[PDB]
Amino acid sequence: ANDLLPPEKAFVPELAVADDGVNVRFRIADGYYMYQAKIVGKTDPADLLGQPSFSKGEEKEDEFFGRQTVYHHEAQVAFPYAKAVGEPYKLVLTYQGCAEVGVCYPPVDTEFDISGNGTYHPQ
């Protein structure tokens, strides 16, 4: 393809932090998709987040990871808090996706410095 996005532009996260935990939204460029099963969150301090629930994805089979549940256009991931969170923390999101034309990008790691409820964007 003559005009492809770098992966951090193809798959763009934002956070909504609330009392119940962290809701992640992704905006995904047309002709790209994200692997649902490869979206991971890690925190510092560790283990503030519990098991995420995912918005509905769709079936895809490709030459990189075979059959996978994937996202086009958008995705939402809801991380509940695993325990009481009354302190600032760092959150690193890792996610991986492809261009439909046949490019499998390396995983992207995006860090957020969280200090209370509100909206956060990559910095």
Instruction: List the CATH number of the domain containing 72.
Output: 2.60.40.1250
100 is known to lie in a ligand binding site: yes
In angstroms, the Cα distances linking 33 to 55, 64, 68 are 14, 13, 11
Query: Smallest Cα–Cα separation from 52: which of 78, 34, 26?
Result: 78
Number of domains observed in the structure of the chain: 1
60 labelled ligand-binding: yes
The residues pairing with 75 across neighbouring beta strands, listed in sequence order, are 26
Rounded to whole angstroms, what are the CA distances from 99 to 7, 19, 22, 32?
Answer: 9, 35, 27, 4
**Could you tell me how many helices (H) and strands (E) the chain has, helices first?**
1, 13
Tell which residue, 78, 119, 93, has the closest CA to residue 11: 93
- Residue pair 76/49 in contact by the 8 Å Cβ criterion: no
Distance, CA of 88 to chain centre: 20
Distance CA 111, CA 93 (A): 6
Handedness of CA 58, 62, 68, 71 (dihedral sign): negative
Decide: 62 and 70 in contact? Cβ < 8 Å. no
Round to whole Å and give the CA distance between 64 and 73. Answer: 20
> Containing domain of residue 96, as a range?
1-123
Q: Select from 40, 17, 23, 39 the least CA-distant residue to 87.
A: 17
Q: Determination method here?
A: X-ray
Q: Is 73 annotated as a binding residue?
A: no
